[PDB]
Write a protein that binds this ligand. Structure first.
Ligand SMILES: [Mg+2]
Ligand SMILES: [Mg+2]
Ligand SMILES: [Mg+2]
Ligand SMILES: [Mg+2]
Ligand SMILES: [Mg+2]
Ligand SMILES: [Mg+2]
Ligand SMILES: [Mg+2]
Ligand SMILES: [Mg+2]
Ligand SMILES: [Mg+2]
Length: 49
RNA sequence: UAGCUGGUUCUCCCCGAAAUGACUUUAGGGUCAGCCUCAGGCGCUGACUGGGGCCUGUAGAGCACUGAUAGGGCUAGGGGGC
């Protein structure tokens, strides 16, 4: 048993998503689409009705 | 600060919307619902269809009600002549 393959347990796969792409998540971000998708939105739990 | 405008970069595979309601100093913004997607459940219930009951007041029609209406009749009221 050596440093080759004590590797992660076929499922802790660290893999964040990247939203600059061209195929995946693209012009807009992961989501987005629109406006008030920018720096924040009021709360939105407790707050904004 | 910017509920505004602009920009957001590799690939292939599956699914795939919405532009509606409610409230909103809300109306090109939002919150919950609606529609999309993923995971774990349940398992013939699903759209569509057959048969069966119930429920309805449109199209049409009708004048019995509410009103409207032309012609005539009979007929109170009025106006005119002896
Ligand atoms: Mg902001
Ligand atoms: Mg498809
Ligand atoms: Mg307006
Ligand atoms: Mg606005
Ligand atoms: Mg059923
Ligand atoms: Mg009649
Ligand atoms: Mg007459
Ligand atoms: Mg007459
Ligand atoms: Mg006279």
């Amino acid at each position: 048993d050596l440093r080759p393959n004590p590797g992660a347990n076929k499922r802790r796969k660290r893999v964040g998503r990247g939203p600059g792409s061209g195929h995946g998540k693209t012009a807009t971000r992961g989501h987005k689409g629109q406006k008030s998708r920018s720096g924040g939105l009021k709360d939105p739990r407790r707050f904004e009705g």
